[PDB]
Amino acid sequence: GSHMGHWSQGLKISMQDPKMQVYKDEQVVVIKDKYPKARYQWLVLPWTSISSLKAVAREHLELLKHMHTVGEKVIVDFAGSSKLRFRLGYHAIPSMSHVHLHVISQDFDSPCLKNKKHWNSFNTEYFLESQAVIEMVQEAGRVTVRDGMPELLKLPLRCHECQQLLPSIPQLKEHLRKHW
DNA sequence: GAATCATAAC
Ligand SMILES: Nc1ncnc2c1ncn2[C@@H]1O[C@H](COP(=O)(O)O)[C@@H](O)[C@H]1O
Ligand code: NA
Ligand SMILES: [Zn+2]
């Protein structure tokens, strides 16, 4: 099929769709995640095209910080009275093109969370904190990732709140209810 | 039987 129509290009289409946009400014857009893995999940994307964190440099440091500030503002404006915790960050190896910041609530209550890969992509070191990425760009000038990131996706299921080991996704989902 | 897992998408 075409390059423009390839599945990996889908964020470039969604980020221009008014029905998916929840915030816009001169630098970034925020969209709803199409397949949210928790009750709240947004993606913050720059208007300017940066393929992934592999292409980030110090010229982008202000932009990464702005993406983070905007993510925090979206939490306040859309979920400020929630008692939910949020994390902001980046998958160590993304699938979709165009750099994007995840802003995700920590309930992980969603039918789109279906497998161990989903769980571990948000609940191991595969999920890079936004602040950590920012500080790496500031101090080292680029984002690097160590070997072994795909292997993290195969780790046994473990609750992020209490560290209990769970044997299946259904049993993890039942367990997570206690932390609401 | 339920759930996981690797593989496939031309
Ligand atoms: N067309 C889309 N619009 C919005 N979010 C999307 C779309 N396609 C995939 N997603 C989400 O984009 C993210 C891509 O994951 P990653 O590349 O690992 O950061 C996932 O959270 C998906 O649910
Ligand atoms: Na992938
Ligand atoms: Zn727990």
Numbering used by the authors: 161 to 340
Give the authors' words.
The APTX RNA‐DNA deadenylase protects genome integrity and corrects abortive DNA ligation arising during ribonucleotide excision repair and base excision DNA repair, and APTX human mutations cause the neurodegenerative disorder ataxia with oculomotor ataxia 1 (AOA1). The aprataxin (APTX) RNA/DNA polynucleotide deadenylase directly reverses 5′‐AMP damage (Ahel et al, 2006; Harris et al, 2009; Reynolds et al, 2009; Tumbale et al, 2011, 2014) and associates with DNA repair scaffolds XRCC1 (Cherry et al, 2015) and XRCC4. Environmental and metabolic sources of DNA damage prompt “abortive ligation”, the failure of ligase to complete step 3, and generation of 5′‐adenylated (5′‐AMP) DNA strand breaks (Ahel et al, 2006; Andres et al, 2015; Schellenberg et al, 2015). AOA1 mutations map to the APTX catalytic domain (Barbot et al, 2001; Moreira et al, 2001; Shimazaki et al, 2002; Le Ber et al, 2003; Tranchant et al, 2003; Criscuolo et al, 2004, 2005; Ito et al, 2005; Mosesso et al, 2005; Baba et al, 2007; Yokoseki et al, 2011) and cause variable age of disease onset.
H201Q: While His201 falls outside of the so‐called HIT domain histidine triad motif, it is highly conserved in HIT domain phosphohydrolases, including APTX homologs. Based on the structure of an adenosine‐vanadate transition‐like state mimic, it is proposed that His201 enables stabilization of the negatively charged transition state of the deadenylation reaction (Tumbale et al, 2014; Schellenberg et al, 2015) via its participation in a charge relay consisting of the main‐chain backbone of Lys197, His201, and His262 that hydrogen bonds to the scissile phosphate of the 5′‐AMP phosphoanhydride. The high‐resolution structure of H201Q (at 1.65 Å) reveals the effects of this substitution on active site chemistry from the histidine to glutamine mutation. In the structure of the H201Q mutant, although the active site undergoes minimal gross structural rearrangements, this charge relay is compromised, likely resulting in the significant reduction in catalytic activity and protein stability. Intriguingly, while seemingly well accommodated in the active site, the H201Q substitution also confers substantial temperature‐dependent effects on catalysis. Close analysis of the backbone conformations of the Tyr200‐Gln201 peptide bond reveals that a strained, but permissible deviation of peptide bond planarity (172–173°) is observed compared to wild‐type APTX (Tumbale et al, 2014). This non‐native backbone conformation in part could explain the thermal stability defect for H201Q. Precisely how the H201Q substitution disrupts the APTX charge relay system will require future NMR or neutron scattering analysis of active site protonation states.
